[PDB]
Assembly symmetry: none
């Protein structure tokens, strides 16, 4: 399934880079509804020699559907086809996430930031504003690993080598 999802990109790499993904997105969207259903997604991949069944399709849509619409919009689809980051880059992030997550339950919260960072604006209200920086656009007081990972998708994309990324992360977080 992930192998099928990688063959898609390998195939997209034959010309298509992210502006091309929107172009392909809209050719997948048969009804033009501006989102992809598991059905539309499946028939589109079939046209490319990639085969998975409906339950597999819903599964892929389930994974990338970030707002529980049961469907893939342009943003989610673009995030789906982003070439995954190399493992070394992923490892330093992982590493820095562990640091940040004092409590080590799997998510970073205002409480994890207590003791590590610090009339109007109070204490953890400031701490909350810090948490927000790394959080998604819709702040909910929790930072996942996936979210933390997005926060750095920008600079990572800019930086051409793992060592540039690795060196930066190492110093930022004193790993």
């Amino acid at each position: 399934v992930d192998a099928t999802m990688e063959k898609l990109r390998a195939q997209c790499l034959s010309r298509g880079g992210i502006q091309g993904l929107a172009r392909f997105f809209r050719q997948l969207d048969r009804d033009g509804s501006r989102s992809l259903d598991a059905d539309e997604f499946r028939q589109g991949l079939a046209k490319l020699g990639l085969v998975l069944d409906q339950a597999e399709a819903e599964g892929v849509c389930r994974k990338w559907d970030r707002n529980g619409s049961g469907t893939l919009d342009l943003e989610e689809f673009l995030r789906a086809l982003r070439p995954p980051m190399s493992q070394a880059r992923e490892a330093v992030i992982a590493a820095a996430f562990a640091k940040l997550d004092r409590s080590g339950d799997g998510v970073v919260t205002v409480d994890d930031l207590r003791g590590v960072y610090s009339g109007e604006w109070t204490e953890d209200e400031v701490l909350r504003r810090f948490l927000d920086n790394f959080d998604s656009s819709e702040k909910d007081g929790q930072v996942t690993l996936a979210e933390f990972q997005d926060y750095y998708s920008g600079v990572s994309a800019s930086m051409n080598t793992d060592e540039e990324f690795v060196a930066m992360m190492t110093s930022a977080w004193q790993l």
Copy 2:
């Protein structure tokens, strides 16, 4: 001395030289889609690499994983892999040593739990997978074809034989591994 097993040196020489599908099919004189000890023997002579009868039989016996008495494509492809240098063997063992927390010779989910947290994983955050299930999933990749939550050094080595063969220089391979397992 203890730990040593007797093994044939002249076979190692002939086997090296050889290393340096199209080829398999050439050698498969009788089109059986597998190599007799006898055919392998004749093929190598036709190429100027000399092996007697038992030496050729010895090589089939040791690469014929499934015990068909013969070498098929998968088995032949494996045999031609270059021997693993001290350096590559060293990073593999260091990575295995790291994973095997209990130090009982096998890497299990229980080992892994002391090395990695699986909690931050997206499939755990959605409620669909447990930490141990992500950890088991990770373990399976290194496991033999029959998954049993146990990965032995043999199995670990077998897993990396293929990957190793993919990279040209010891240094690429050593650095890869050092970044993969953070040693």
